[PDB]
Amino acid sequence: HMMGPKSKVFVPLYVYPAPGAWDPLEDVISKHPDVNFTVVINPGSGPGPEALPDGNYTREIPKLASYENVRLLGYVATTYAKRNISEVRRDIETYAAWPTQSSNANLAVRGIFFDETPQQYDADILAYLRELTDVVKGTSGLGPDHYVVHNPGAIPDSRYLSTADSTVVFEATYATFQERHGAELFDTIPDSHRDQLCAVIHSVPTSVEGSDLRGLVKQVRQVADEIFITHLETDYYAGFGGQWSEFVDLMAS
Numbered sequence: 001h002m003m004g005p006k007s008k009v010f011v012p013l014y015v016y017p018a019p020g021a022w023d024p025l026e027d028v029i030s031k032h033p034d035v036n037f038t039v040v041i042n043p044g045s046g047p048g049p050e051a052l053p054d055g056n057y058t059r060e061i062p063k064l065a066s067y068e069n070v071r072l073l074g075y076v077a078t079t080y081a082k083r084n085i086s087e088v089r090r091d092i093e094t095y096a097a098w099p100t101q102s103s104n105a106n107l108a109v110r111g112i113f114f115d116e117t118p119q120q121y122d123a124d125i126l127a128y129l130r131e132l133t134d135v136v137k138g139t140s141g142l143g144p145d146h147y148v149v150h151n152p153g154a155i156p157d158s159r160y161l162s163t164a165d166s167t168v169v170f171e172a173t174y175a176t177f178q179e180r181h182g183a184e185l186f187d188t189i190p191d192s193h194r195d196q197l198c199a200v201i202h203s204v205p206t207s208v209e210g211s212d213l214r215g216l217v218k219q220v221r222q223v224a225d226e227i228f229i230t231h232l233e234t235d236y237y238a239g240f241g242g243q244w245s246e247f248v249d250l251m252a253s
């Protein structure tokens with residue numbers, strides 16, 4: 001009659017920061033100081049072409065950063081490790097330089113979310129990702145956490161998991177989750193622990209509500225330490241689902 005292991009709320013926050021747009025996230029952060037939030041921001045598939053993001057980002061990001069239970073990460077694309085590593089490094093360094101380039105201590109992130117990491121094992125690809133982790137851990141401006149997340153959007157070879165602090169090993173519809181027998185899918189992953197794993201479930205039917213939603217949250221908390229669940233089928237990373245506060249309430253329980 002408990003919810004099992006506690007998980008963090010993972011938020012791919014690709015809502016454009018117009019005035020008020022991030023209010024639903026700030027509200028639940030405020031309501032649940034005991035809950036830990038991992039929040040990815042993404043000005044333009046990366047930090048953007050300049051040293052600093054636009055006026056809306058520069059206003060809103062520090063408001064989120066001001067909460068102790070928020071861990072902000074900068075989105076960086078890797079294009080299945082095919083992207084030139086110097087260009088990836090440029091993006092990491094740009095995020096890292098944000099607080100000093102802005103003279104705003106709170107215009108900063110605490111790590112990097114690497115999108116599109118590949119599933120298939122390859123030694124050269126492992127070396128690429130490990131170097132990227134070294135860059136994140138070693139660069140001023142990404143502290144204190146220097147957090148690293150990989151998003152293969154599917155289960156990668158287990159040898160990749162130790163290179164990141166968290167790996168998104170599920171990112172698909174609720175229907176796909178169900179086709180794969182839910183939490184059972186996570187049991188197939190060798191050399192792994194829930195603490196290394198993130199699950200993203202979108203397109204949840206609005207009928208999965210109340211105790212039905214509690215059940216899903218509990219099932220996923222058992223196997224993944226970071227979780228995003230939303231009932232949106234469209235723009236599920238660019239808006240809040242109709243049961244966003246209920247989802248966070250369950251994560252807090």
Ligand SMILES: CC(=O)N[C@@H]1[C@@H](O)[C@@H](O)[C@@H](CO)O[C@H]1O
Nearest residue numbers: 012075115116151153171200237
């Ligand atoms: C959970 C997550 O982050 N998914 C990414 C998202 O960041 C965005 O890049 C999207 C379209 O660009 O592609 C997905 O791979």
Ligand SMILES: [Cl-]
Nearest residue numbers: 231232233234
């Ligand atoms: Cl929708």
